[PDB]
Amino acid sequence: RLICINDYEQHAKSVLPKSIYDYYRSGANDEETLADNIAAFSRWKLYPRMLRNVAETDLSTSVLGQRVSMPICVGATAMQRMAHVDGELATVRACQSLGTGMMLSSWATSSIEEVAEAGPEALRWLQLYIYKDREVTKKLVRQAEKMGYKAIFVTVDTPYLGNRLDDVRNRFKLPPQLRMKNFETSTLSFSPEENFGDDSGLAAYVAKAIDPSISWEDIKWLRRLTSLPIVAKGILRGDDAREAVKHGLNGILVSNHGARQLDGVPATIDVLPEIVEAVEGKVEVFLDGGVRKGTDVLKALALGAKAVFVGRPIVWGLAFQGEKGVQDVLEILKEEFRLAMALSGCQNVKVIDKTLVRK
Numbered sequence: 044r045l046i047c048i049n050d051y052e053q054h055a056k057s058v059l060p061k062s063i064y065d066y067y068r069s070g071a072n073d074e075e076t077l078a079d080n081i082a083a084f085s086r087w088k089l090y091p092r093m094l095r096n097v098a099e100t101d102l103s104t105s106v107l108g109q110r111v112s113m114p115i116c117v118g119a120t121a122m123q124r125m126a127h128v129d130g131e132l133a134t135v136r137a138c139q140s141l142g143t144g145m146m147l148s149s150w151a152t153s154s155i156e157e158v159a160e161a162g163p164e165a166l167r168w169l170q171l172y173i174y175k176d177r178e179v180t181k182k183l184v185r186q187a188e189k190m191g192y193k194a195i196f197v198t199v200d201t202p203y204l205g206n207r208l209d210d211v212r213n214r215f216k217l218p219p220q221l222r223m224k225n226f227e228t229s230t231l232s233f234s235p236e237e238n239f240g241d242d243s244g245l246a247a248y249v250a251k252a253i254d255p256s257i258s259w260e261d262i263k264w265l266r267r268l269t270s271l272p273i274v275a276k277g278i279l280r281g282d283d284a285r286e287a288v289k290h291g292l293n294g295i296l297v298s299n300h301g302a303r304q305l306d307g308v309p310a311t312i313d314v315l316p317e318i319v320e321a322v323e324g325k326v327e328v329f330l331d332g333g334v335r336k337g338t339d340v341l342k343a344l345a346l347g348a349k350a351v352f353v354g355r356p357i358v359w360g361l362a363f364q365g366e367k368g369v370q371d372v373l374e375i376l377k378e379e380f381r382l383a384m385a386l387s388g389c390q391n392v393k394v395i396d397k398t399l400v401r402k
């Protein structure tokens with residue numbers, strides 16, 4: 044049956060309710076950036092070295108000082124229990140098996156503590172939104188600390204939600220039995236049965252809960268709040284990347300939010316080199332957006348990323364077979380990446396160099 048990431052999406056479309064598949068699939072507006080996150084990878088061509096001895100390929104690396112089995116990690120995707128009953132618990136168990144890390148959404152359908160209990164040995168990080176209520180925000184950071192999470196990925200590209208047309212058409216909301224489990228009030232939990240207007244429920248949730256005023260001053264607050272490593276997630280400009288470094292942050296996740304926020308921004312693989320150049324080696328730079336194949340991972344590392352994060356493929360893995368489906372998606376990416384390394388002449392990630400790619 045399913046032998047590549049595209050097969051998993053096709054299967055997911057066949058089993059998921061339309062509103063759920065559309066929520067997960069969609070980009071913003073006319074979905075120009077959604078298409079380009081994938082197309083852009085195809086424009087970067089590979090220049091493989093031959094005869095390098097690739098009998099012993101070592102995919103291991105490190106993310107913010109923590110060892111991982113491969114430079115391929117799970118990105119934050121909200122509300123994973125829509126795809127499979129075990130949701131984020133399934134995901135974390137698969138990451139533990141693979142030896143890679145899971146970035147947990149602030150909008151998860153499982154709590155910070157539930158996920159730590161399901162994956163005690165898994166490398167785990169918290170993706171944070173800055174809520175208007177700073178006490179909610181602080182509690183999230185404190186729970187992450189207490190529960191053994193190793194970094195905070197602060198999302199900086201979502202002062203408001205992007206306009207995902209299908210979610211507006213479908214009047215997207217959670218299924219009745221589910222909630223955003225990190226919160227206790229009906230509104231902050233995204234309770235269906237609560238008034239989220241007549242368009243996308245999630246856009247109205249964001250408008251009610253998430254602070255559109257945040258600024259660099261709020262990054263200063265967050266940097267003083269926690270001594271955990273903090274990564275700025277959603278940076279697309281070199282000037283903003285230099286500002287993140289100036290604020291004492293510890294990495295940059297080059298991201299257009301899976302093309303779900305501002306449509307018409309560049310593909311992340313295309314902006315990666317500017318950002319790598321701008322940070323001058325001071326912090327690790329990561330990528331997400333459009334990673335589907337081992338060669339995508341290779342290209343991102345050649346251009347200077349430490350690791351990549353995958354969003355939608357993980358959700359499709361859940362939709363197929365929960366924990367096992369996520370494990371299989373990650374194993375496919377791992378094997379494709381191993382093969383791409385070997386065929387390119389790379390024994391390990393340290394020798395994946397800039398001469399391997401040209402646009």
Ligand SMILES: Cc1cc2nc3c(=O)[nH]c(=O)nc-3n(C[C@H](O)[C@H](O)[C@H](O)COP(=O)(O)O)c2cc1C
Nearest residue numbers: 067119120121148198300301331332333353354355
């Ligand atoms: C269904 C879905 C839900 C997401 N939820 C969140 C979220 O809760 N927090 C966040 O910072 N980013 C979220 N993102 C953005 C992802 O972290 C990531 O940037 C993106 O999925 C990467 O692109 P990819 O799906 O092409 O792999 C979401 C993305 C998708 C597709």
Ligand SMILES: NC(=O)c1c[nH]c(C2CC2)n1
Nearest residue numbers: 044045046364367368371
């Ligand atoms: N990729 C497949 O066709 C497939 C079938 N069953 C499974 C389980 C995850 C082990 N994977």
Ligand SMILES: NC(=O)c1c[nH]c(C2CC2)n1
Nearest residue numbers: 266267270290291292293
């Ligand atoms: N924990 C850190 O990596 C870090 C960098 N800069 C600061 C300032 C004291 C706020 N903290």
